[PDB]
Amino acid sequence: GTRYAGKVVVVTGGGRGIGAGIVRAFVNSGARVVICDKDESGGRALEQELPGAVFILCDVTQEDDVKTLVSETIRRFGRLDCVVNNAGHHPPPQRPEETSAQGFRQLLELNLLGTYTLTKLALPYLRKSQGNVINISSLVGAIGQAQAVPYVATKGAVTAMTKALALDESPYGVRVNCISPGNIWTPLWEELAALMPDPRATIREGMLAQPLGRMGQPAEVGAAAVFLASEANFCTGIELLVTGGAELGYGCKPDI
Amino acid sequence: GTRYAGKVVVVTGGGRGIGAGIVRAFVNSGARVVICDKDESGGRALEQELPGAVFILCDVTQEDDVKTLVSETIRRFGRLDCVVNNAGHHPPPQRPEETSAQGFRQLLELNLLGTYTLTKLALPYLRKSQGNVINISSLVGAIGQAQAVPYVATKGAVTAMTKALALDESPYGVRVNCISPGNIWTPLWEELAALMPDPRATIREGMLAQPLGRMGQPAEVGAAAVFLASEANFCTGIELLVTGGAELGYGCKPDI
Amino acid sequence: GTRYAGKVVVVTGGGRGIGAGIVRAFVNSGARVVICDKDESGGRALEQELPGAVFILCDVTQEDDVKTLVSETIRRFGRLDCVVNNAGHHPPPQRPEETSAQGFRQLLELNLLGTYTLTKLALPYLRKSQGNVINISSLVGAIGQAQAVPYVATKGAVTAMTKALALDESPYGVRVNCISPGNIWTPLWEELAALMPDPRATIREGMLAQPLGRMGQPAEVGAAAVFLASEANFCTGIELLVTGGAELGYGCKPDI
Amino acid sequence: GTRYAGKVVVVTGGGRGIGAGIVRAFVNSGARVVICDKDESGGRALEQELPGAVFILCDVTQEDDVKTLVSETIRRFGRLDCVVNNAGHHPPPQRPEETSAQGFRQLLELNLLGTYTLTKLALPYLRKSQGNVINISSLVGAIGQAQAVPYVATKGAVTAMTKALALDESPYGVRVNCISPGNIWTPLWEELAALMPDPRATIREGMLAQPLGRMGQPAEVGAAAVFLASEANFCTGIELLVTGGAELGYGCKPDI
Ligand SMILES: NC(=O)c1ccc[n+]([C@@H]2O[C@H](COP(=O)([O-])OP(=O)(O)OC[C@H]3O[C@@H](n4cnc5c(N)ncnc54)[C@H](O)[C@@H]3O)[C@@H](O)[C@H]2O)c1
Ligand SMILES: NC(=O)c1ccc[n+]([C@@H]2O[C@H](COP(=O)([O-])OP(=O)(O)OC[C@H]3O[C@@H](n4cnc5c(N)ncnc54)[C@H](O)[C@@H]3O)[C@@H](O)[C@H]2O)c1
Ligand SMILES: NC(=O)c1ccc[n+]([C@@H]2O[C@H](COP(=O)([O-])OP(=O)(O)OC[C@H]3O[C@@H](n4cnc5c(N)ncnc54)[C@H](O)[C@@H]3O)[C@@H](O)[C@H]2O)c1
Ligand SMILES: NC(=O)c1ccc[n+]([C@@H]2O[C@H](COP(=O)([O-])OP(=O)(O)OC[C@H]3O[C@@H](n4cnc5c(N)ncnc54)[C@H](O)[C@@H]3O)[C@@H](O)[C@H]2O)c1
Ligand SMILES: Oc1cc(Oc2cccc(-c3cccc(O)c3F)n2)ccc1F
Ligand SMILES: Oc1cc(Oc2cccc(-c3cccc(O)c3F)n2)ccc1F
Ligand SMILES: Oc1cc(Oc2cccc(-c3cccc(O)c3F)n2)ccc1F
Ligand SMILES: Oc1cc(Oc2cccc(-c3cccc(O)c3F)n2)ccc1F
Ligand SMILES: OC[C@H]1O[C@@H](O)[C@H](O)[C@@H](O)[C@@H]1O
Ligand SMILES: OC[C@H]1O[C@@H](O)[C@H](O)[C@@H](O)[C@@H]1O
Ligand SMILES: OC[C@H]1O[C@@H](O)[C@H](O)[C@@H](O)[C@@H]1O
Ligand SMILES: OC[C@H]1O[C@@H](O)[C@H](O)[C@@H](O)[C@@H]1O
Ligand code: NA
Ligand code: NA
Ligand code: NA
Ligand code: NA
């Protein structure tokens, strides 16, 4: 209730899924939270539910939406301590020959450039507060995934960008870190599975891809984010894996 | 004060340095802590200072000392939730030709096999409590260090062993993680620097090896350990870097 | 002279620097090489110098240039075995607040989407030949670099995309790998250094960033590419570091 | 036939499996090779088969055997250019509680300290020739394996030690690299599979653990070793993965 008291946090894509879990974790740590989302439904309800959270409609691909997000956060709360760049999307499975450069550009706009834009607009305020940036990347940026060339590329970019920005902002006392979740049970996961021939088999395989034998929860990503914001004062440029061990060991992926 | 309430933690090498910082962090989180050390001086004083911590003399290279450590922890506190394998040593700088197989074996006994032995003896109790293991490795296991072949090898072993054991213990609900610190200001760091021709220059270089421009503190490693024990329920087999960004970018290490 | 005899290779950005070194290495291995470049000067001279190499003017950011590159390679040589995606650029040092989303998009077009486009257009022919893709990424995609947020992000994307595509193309026998060079002495390196206040000091620091004490040569990247094409039949999705050890150890990047 | 002509190479464990593949690759590159093995059967036959290879009986865990190996190589051939530390063993699957500290020490003696000892004794000669060291580690040192805590730890140690030694030997022009194979079809693989309830199912799973859908060959590890010795002049401290993509993507390893 006090580990991040007095602090102001912006969470993009905070209306459902991982983002909502991060919002809840920060509120529970004593922070005031601005929920940014392009969809009103979840975020508005979350603002009614949580004292200490408010909702601002903002599409992170629209530069003027993001400018207004930052200026309204400062106008309403007087400071900015942490930006969590969580908004992102995973397209349906797509074989490489079924992808397009224009779909790839669109996905870069959301998963990479939206993170870049908010971070850039927020950094002057983060420098004043010795605040920090937390980017939500993905394990698959590090190890790859099948039928997801554009998505994987966007997350490799986010993880790398996190390290570059950590170097650039270190002289100013602003830490920049990322979290790479594995399979987290969210509405995106449920929507992707529903597209498959056997959604139940897809979900079962998703649970068993982790040594821990289940998928992760938004609250577990949220606790990692609160740690990075509030207690990881010597961590910058790290990639914190929240994956249940999926990257470990051999699996289902004589010498001729 | 309550994030790890009711839990029992063993910290090896807990009498000074990083270990003492981890002890303090766990006590502050509400746990009872057993301080294991081969040196009475720091650990006994820490037991007097901290309600909730007690000291047990134990050299982790001596199997019967470790057996007694575990059986006394259970006899006195009734459960075991977390083992922090922190005891270890860094020899003075040694060029490869100045090392010996027998010095290498001795360092393996402490930095690797002591961690192995306590973990093995503790695992039956950790399974009962769905507890966890935290090994203190080192950034240099991942990236190397000059004049430290044996030390580097021992830490590469610890980090790898953490992943193997995480796979083996996942079916039983026991997580196994490691922390890889960079330069942390401790009595070991101070003792190593005092051996150098210009200790002050060695310390200054140590501070500047991190983008953050300072060395880390035992309390920062301690906060990472408390996160891994108490809030990282979907993390297993991870290497949590607490290094101030030392692994990032180019440094001081035309084409002929 | 025979390790890649009978094979046809396309090298983008092959007119100078690393690309020209890769062209020479493949010609020396017995392959026929198509030099792609947006600049006529170096590539045309290279075509006159090397029997077995020909030059095709092609800007990899222009989809119809790339379509013609592939169709002319097939029309003239009857097969395609290897694509080396080397074309790319490093902007001058830019602090994060001096970058723009539109500059970032432009750099993505070259360093990431040009690689994507040629690969996509080439893959039907690579499947027929059980050929392979080699992407030239950068060490800084993995470890970060200062004053280079957009560049670093593009190379993290390339390395990640390499892994995704390796997964997707494995059933078809097409390997996809990348090379991550460190400091290689090329016209780009020389042009960037000339912008600095003391170019000589910048170059000296560049040599000393590697434990080997020099920068690398285009011929060394070329030999790595020939290995990946011709002899690495069980390697797919790898990142082959050609960096002189720059990522190893501590450098120039008490606890307060 | 000439890429490593005039050079002298020592391959430990060269009598069968990967080691024999490395021996053959170096002979085919024009080098003279000393086959070291503790077993006479395979190595003696290989010496009869290959002009340019000779067999020396040597157990790498016995320091005086290794001293004689080096002194006989110099006496007979006048120089030493490359050491390949391939000798090693994988115990049968062992749950953590079934391992022992004394078995762990024994495995460290072979997989880690034998590599250390030969390297140390060879380095004075490698400095004279600006030669290089190649250690055969394992992918599982990096990602873990189930039922193999001691083996995994030994290979994490080898990979880390490679980086440390690369730093130490860089001023002297001696490169130190490792190869991390995945599943390679060798007599060790066949012997381990024969211990399983269904050896055929174990082998089938082993083939399918790689995106490439087969296991690797000793000749493929051998080609990687020849590349590292003869053409990778700007590579030091690298871990070259020869794994068929096993580390990529998700596999067989809702949120409660
Ligand atoms: N779920 C997983 O398994 C998983 C794994 C790894 C990484 N991730 C990453 O975690 C993040 C959140 O994923 P999730 O599963 O919670 O997704 P989700 O679809 O359940 O929730 C995403 C939220 O972001 C919002 N959003 C989307 N586009 C936006 C835009 N342009 N501007 C503002 N808000 C926008 C959506 O409206 C939604 O509320 C994403 O970056 C995703 O890539 C998810
Ligand atoms: N200080 C750093 O910069 C740094 C960096 C990376 C990793 N580490 C690791 O962190 C750990 C702690 O290092 P530190 O700097 O705090 O060291 P330290 O020497 O200051 O403290 C180590 C403690 O361990 C105890 N210990 C040593 N051998 C023991 C044994 N056989 N049995 C029981 N206790 C024993 C010592 O008595 C001491 O109290 C070590 O594993 C070290 O390798 C330290
Ligand atoms: N030089 C280094 O230290 C270094 C380090 C790591 C990675 N790299 C990468 O290696 C690659 C080559 O770098 P370099 O140093 O040789 O650069 P360079 O500038 O010396 O040569 C690049 C070549 O690519 C061509 N090119 C540029 N844009 C193109 C386009 N749109 N279409 C076609 N050709 C185009 C240029 O005309 C030139 O001939 C780049 O991808 C770079 O990011 C270089
Ligand atoms: N086969 C795989 O899938 C695989 C995968 C990753 C790593 N590796 C590593 O590759 C190396 C070779 O493995 P392999 O599968 O070819 O094994 P193998 O058992 O088929 O051959 C090993 C050879 O080393 C010799 N050897 C063993 N102990 C020795 C000693 N004390 N002194 C000298 N020689 C000794 C054996 O007699 C034998 O000829 C090992 O280090 C192993 O850990 C193998
Ligand atoms: O970033 C990630 C996003 C994820 O979303 C989902 C959800 C359901 C299925 C899939 C999926 C699995 C295999 C291939 C593929 O293209 C997928 F989209 N990903 C899953 C894991 C991640 F690390
Ligand atoms: O595990 C580590 C242990 C460390 O201890 C120290 C302390 C002072 C100096 C050194 C040191 C620096 C360079 C070479 C060397 O051999 C050293 F011991 N390490 C420093 C960093 C780590 F990641
Ligand atoms: O991809 C790379 C590209 C490189 O180009 C150059 C050349 C000269 C200077 C720099 C440079 C150094 C520090 C910061 C920065 O922004 C630079 F551009 N990079 C150097 C290393 C790489 F890995
Ligand atoms: O170093 C390695 C050594 C290997 O040997 C073998 C051979 C057959 C089975 C196994 C194996 C598989 C799963 C668990 C386990 O304990 C094994 F030994 N490893 C396989 C892969 C490696 F990377
Ligand atoms: O839709 C899948 C899951 O999404 C998560 O974000 C919600 O917190 C869960 O209640 C829900 O089951
Ligand atoms: O000796 C160096 C440092 O060691 C740390 O463990 C102590 O907490 C500090 O008070 C001390 O300055
Ligand atoms: O311009 C720097 C260097 O670029 C390389 O590509 C050329 O091969 C060298 O001859 C030149 O010195
Ligand atoms: O025993 C399994 C395999 O081992 C390899 O080292 C040999 O080259 C193969 O001929 C054999 O099939
Ligand atoms: Na509210
Ligand atoms: Na006490
Ligand atoms: Na020509
Ligand atoms: Na012979």
Neighbouring chains to A with at least 3 Cβ pairs closer than 8 Å: B, C, D
Element (H, E) at A40: helix A40-49
What is the distance, to the nearest Å, from the Cα of residue A159 to the centroid of all Cα atoms in its chain?
11
Compute the distance between CA of residue C163 and CA of residue C238 in angstroms, rounded to an integer.
7
Q: Token pair for residue C112?
A: 């990431």
Catalytic residues of A: 151
Please tell me the distance between residue D44's alpha carbon and the centre of ligand 4 in angstroms. 17
d(CA C109, CA C59): 11
Is C14's C-beta closer than 6 angstroms to any atom of ligand 11?
no
Q: Tell me whether residue D197 is exposed, middle or buried, using C-beta atoms within 10 angstroms of its C-beta: 0 to 12, 13 to 18, 19 or more.
A: exposed
Helices B149-169 and D149-169 cross at an angle (nearest 10°) of 150
Helical (H) or strand (E) element with A8:
strand A8-12
The C-alpha atoms of residue A142 and residue A122 are separated, in whole angstroms, by 27
Cβ distance B177 to B238 under 8 Å?
Answer: yes
Token pair of B12 as six digits: 């090896």
Q: Interhelix angle for B149-169 vs B115-129, to 10°?
A: 20
Active site amino acids of D: 151
Q: In 3D, which of D141, A8, A107, B3 has the Cα closest to residue C108?
A: A107
Structure tokens at D199: 């050896």
DSSP state of A195: T
Q: C116 catalytic, yes or no?
A: no
Tally of residues, chain D? 256
Least Cα distance to B82 among B231, B185, B240 occurs for B231
- As given in the structure block, the two tokens for residue D203 are 């082998």
C139: how many CB neighbours lie within 10 A of its CB? 24
- Letter string b/e over residues C35-47, b meaning 16 or more CB atoms within 10 A of that residue's CB: bbbbeeebbbebb
Contacts of D216 in chain A (CB under 8 A): 255
Q: Cα torsion at B155, B159, B162, B164 (round to 10°)?
A: -110
**CA-to-CA distance for D158 and D201, rounded, in angstroms?**
30
Give the C-alpha separation, A199 to A195, whole Å. 7
Q: Which residues contact B67 (CB under 8 A, 6 or more apart)?
A: B121
Q: What is the amino acid identity at position C149? A: V
Q: Which H/E stretch holds residue A25?
A: helix A17-28
CB contact at 8 A, A2 and A23: no
CB D245 within 8 A of CB C237: yes
Length of chain B: 256
Q: Which residue has the tokens 């397009």?
A: A100
- The C-alpha of A76 sits at a distance from chain C's nearest C-alpha, in angstroms, of 24
**Under 8 Å between Cβ of D137 and D155:** yes
**Host H or E run for residue A73:** helix A63-77
Chain C environment of B144 (Cβ under 8 Å): 248-249
Q: Note whether B159 and B181 are within 8 A (CB).
A: no
Nearest CB neighbour to D236, from listed C171, C217, C245: C245
**Could you tell me if D7 and D31 are in contact, meaning their C-beta atoms sit under 8 angstroms apart?**
yes
Nearest to B104 by CA among B139, B145, B141, B151: B151
Residue type, D215: M
For residue B6, report the distance from its CA to the centre of ligand 2, in Å: 27
Looking at the DSSP assignment, which residues form a beta bridge with residue B34? B10, B54
A198 exposed, middle or buried (CB, 10 Å; 0-12, 13-18, 19+)?
exposed
B/e letters for B71-80, b = 16+ CB within 10 Å, e = fewer, are eebeeebeeb
**Residue A98, beta-bridge partner list:** none
Give the closest residue to D56 by CA, choosing from D26, D94, D88, D13.
D13
Give the 3-state secondary structure of chain D: CCCCCCCEEEEECCCCHHHHHHHHHHHHCCCEEEEEECCHHHHHHHHHHCCCEEEEECCCCCHHHHHHHHHHHHHHHCCCCEEEECCCCCCCCCCHHHCCHHHHHHHHHHHHHHHHHHHHHHHHHHHHHCCEEEEECCCHHHHCCCCCHHHHHHHHHHHHHHHHHHHHHHHHCCEEEEEEECCECCHHHHHHHHCCCCHHHHHHHHHHCCCCCCCECHHHHHHHHHHHHHCCCCCCCCEEEECCCCCCCCCCCCCC
From C182, B210, C149, C159, select the one nearest A135 (Cα to Cα): C149
Distance CA(D63)–CA(D54), nearest Å, equals 21
Lining ligand 9 with CB less than 6 A are: A 16-17, 185-187, 190, 218
CATH number of the structural domain B1-256 = 3.40.50.720
Cβ contacts of C166 on chain D, cutoff 8 Å: 211, 245, 248
- Tracing tokens 């990881």 back to the chain, one arrives at A232
Its sign, for the CA torsion C47, C52, C53, C56, is positive
Q: What angle is formed at CA C228 by the lines to CA C226 and CA C233, rounded to 5 degrees?
A: 125
**Mutation for testing the D interface, residue in B60, B107, B115, B116 having most D CBs under 10 Å:** B116
B2 touches B28 (CB < 8 A): no
What HEC string does chain B produce?
Answer: CCCCCCCEEEEECCCCHHHHHHHHHHHHCCCEEEEEECCHHHHHHHHHHCCCEEEEECCCCCHHHHHHHHHHHHHHHCCCCEEEECCCCCCCCCCHHHCCHHHHHHHHHHHHHHHHHHHHHHHHHHHHHCCEEEEECCCHHHHCCCCCHHHHHHHHHHHHHHHHHHHHHHHHCCEEEEEEECCECCHHHHHHHHCCCCHHHHHHHHHHCCCCCCCECHHHHHHHHHHHHHCCCCCCCCEEEECCCCCCCCCCCCCC
Which residue, A96, A238, D159, A91, is CA-closest to C120?
A96
Q: How far apart are CA C158 and CA C154, in angstroms?
A: 6
Q: What sections of A80-214 are H helices per DSSP?
A: 101-108, 115-129, 140-143, 149-169, 187-194, 199-208
Radius of gyration of chain A (CA): 18
Angle between helical axes of D218-230 and C218-230 (0-180°, round to 10): 170
The approach used to solve this structure was: X-ray
Question: Which residue from B minimizes the CA distance to D117?
Answer: B101
Here the tokens at position A253 are 């992926």
In three state form, how does the secondary structure of chain C look?
A: CCCCCCCEEEEECCCCHHHHHHHHHHHHCCCEEEEEECCHHHHHHHHHHCCCEEEEECCCCCHHHHHHHHHHHHHHHCCCCEEEECCCCCCCCCCHHHCCHHHHHHHHHHHHHHHHHHHHHHHHHHHHHCCEEEEECCCHHHHCCCCCHHHHHHHHHHHHHHHHHHHHHHHHCCEEEEEEECCECCHHHHHHHHCCCCHHHHHHHHHHCCCCCCCECHHHHHHHHHHHHHCCCCCCCCEEEECCCCCCCCCCCCCC
Q: Residue A121 corresponds to which tokens in the numbers above?
A: 């607009």
Residue B194 CB less than 6 A away from ligand 10: no
In C, which residues are within 8 Å of B209 by CB distance? 250-253
Q: Closest Cα partner for A94 from D201, B232, C164?
A: C164
Residue B12 pairs in a beta bridge with B36
What's the gap in Å between B36 CA and the centre of ligand 10? 18
Strand order in the sheet with D32-37: D53-57, D32-37, D8-12, D82-85, D132-136, D175-181, D239-242
After which residues does chain B break, using C–N > 2.5 Å? 253
The rounded distance, in Å, linking the Cα atoms of C118 and C136 is 13
Residue B163 structure tokens: 């992943």
Q: Is A109 on the interface with B (CB under 8 A)?
A: no
For C8, list phi and psi in degrees, rounded to 5. Answer: -120, 130
Cα–Cα distance for residue pair B83/A14, rounded to 1 Å: 36
State the nearest Cα–Cα gap between D175 and chain B, in angstroms: 14
Resolution (A): 1.5
Whether A156 sits inside 8 A of C154 (CB atoms) is no
Query: ∠ CA(A230), CA(A231), CA(A233), 5° rounding?
Result: 100
Burial pattern D130-168, b for ≥16 Cβ within 10 A else e, equals ebbbbbbbbbbbbbbbbbbbbbbbbbbbbbbbbbbbbbb
Take residue C214 and report the two structure tokens written for it: 């020099």
Would you call C143 an interface residue with chain B, using a CB distance cutoff of 8 Å? Answer: yes
